[PDB]
Amino acid sequence: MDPMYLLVDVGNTHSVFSITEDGKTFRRWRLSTGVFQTEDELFSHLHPLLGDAMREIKGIGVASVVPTQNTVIERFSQKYFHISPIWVKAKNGCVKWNVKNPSEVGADRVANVVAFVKEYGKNGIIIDMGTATTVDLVVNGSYEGGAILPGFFMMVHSLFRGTAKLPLVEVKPADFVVGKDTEENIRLGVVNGSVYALEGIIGRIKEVYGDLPVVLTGGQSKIVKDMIKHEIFDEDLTIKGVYHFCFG
Amino acid sequence: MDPMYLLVDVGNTHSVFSITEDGKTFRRWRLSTGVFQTEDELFSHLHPLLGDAMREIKGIGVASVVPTQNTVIERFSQKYFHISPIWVKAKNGCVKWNVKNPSEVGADRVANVVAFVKEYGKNGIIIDMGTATTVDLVVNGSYEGGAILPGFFMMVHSLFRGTAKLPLVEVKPADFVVGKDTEENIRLGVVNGSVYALEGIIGRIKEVYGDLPVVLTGGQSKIVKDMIKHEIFDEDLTIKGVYHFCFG
Ligand SMILES: Nc1ncnc2c1ncn2[C@@H]1O[C@H](COP(=O)(O)OP(=O)(O)O)[C@@H](O)[C@H]1O
Ligand SMILES: Nc1ncnc2c1ncn2[C@@H]1O[C@H](COP(=O)(O)OP(=O)(O)O)[C@@H](O)[C@H]1O
Ligand SMILES: CC(C)(CO)[C@@H](O)C(=O)NCCC(=O)O
């Protein structure tokens, strides 16, 4: 048959919920992660979204970078589906983990890499733009490590909150060489700057490890899609990894 | 004679206090800015630092990017010296301010541009690395605008506070192509990344305005100066701007 699987990607600000019956085509929703949220709250939020699909769920797979949120997901799964969720983490097998402490790498990154190696190949660089922006290097099926930078919103918010005079600027790329007002200055600095930062990190990787395909993902990737040379754009990469890790 | 002037640069985290008798050599001290600080508290902090030179101050010049602190600086000058401080502001004269609202550009950036045009030349690119990192464009003695990005610490701190899993990382350049643990990931993304972001903005400026000389300044510039191409390194640039603006 084609059993329905719930795939969860718990991020610091948002949690992605996706259902699939083949691990190839996904229906997805997004909810705020929500600090004090309960299993009943989560069921209540998902009820009018998933609809009838809710009772078809036979397996629950989760990548999570918010540990406090885990007992909530656990209780949701057990209460409403009488199953325990499968948790994405770094383990030996398809991917080699060539870093100092593999258990410390974010579950979202683990998922991204697993998705990459199953779908796209043994060699590549993954850029994931969310709350933080992440760079992950895969070489000959071995995860090599990467970079972590603040996300676009984290950056504009940090400038707003960390200074007296700066307003909160909307995230929008600059189409100019220099900003002519405060907002334009911050747009250029954060958005265009972050793209330069990413391209510079990528360039240096390529001179050591050679030319590798770049895959772009994340909720914040859309805004700057054309600004970074990439071979693949896949907004579903994390959810795909959760599927492959948990359900093959 | 050689009258002693006190120069003040009020930043969002730190305030710089400097004395000069010639506007060529500067003795300088640094304090936390301090939200609820009074004039007597400022005096008490400066007393053992300035010693007897305190009694010799004839003028007080101030660049400030924290409006609430201004009342305190004004009261300090009046109570202890019976003078009003001179405030750095964009005005017409030796610099043309070719931006939408000149009265909105930070007083420290104004001071930087005044110091540069007076001391270094008509054309240049100023990089001030502080709480936020600034890029300023000067063409034919005319201020053209710039970029604003979060500073190094602002970045590592925003990653720490904006995520569940990430620690507060020390600001130190990465000497590797990819980080092998969490701390190395953040260092590469933040410190090397921000250097790459600046090199891109600068490179793009130089495409339109030619090979302008680059000036480095700011408390955070030291750790990164061997990573950015620059013709001038001047940690006194803002304070020089305060002196030239106020005291000629
Ligand atoms: N305080 C906030 N106010 C408004 N929007 C926010 C805030 N914090 C984050 N966002 C939005 O959330 C998104 C970042 O989260 P997301 O891309 O889902 O990453 P993650 O999956 O890691 O949570 C951005 O699109 C940003 O605009
Ligand atoms: N919460 C904090 N804890 C420790 N150090 C901090 C904190 N916030 C800021 N700093 C320090 O202040 C520095 C920024 O201040 P500075 O370079 O003097 O710029 P400004 O002149 O704009 O205040 C950071 O690099 C950091 O080392
Ligand atoms: C970098 C984030 C915050 C991205 O969501 C996440 O991947 C994470 O919590 N990581 C743990 C640190 C690491 O990946 O090394």
Ligand SMILES: CC(C)(CO)[C@@H](O)C(=O)NCCC(=O)O
């Ligand atoms: C960007 C900072 C915070 C740098 O210290 C400051 O110069 C400032 O408050 N500026 C006002 C914004 C502007 O210059 O357009």
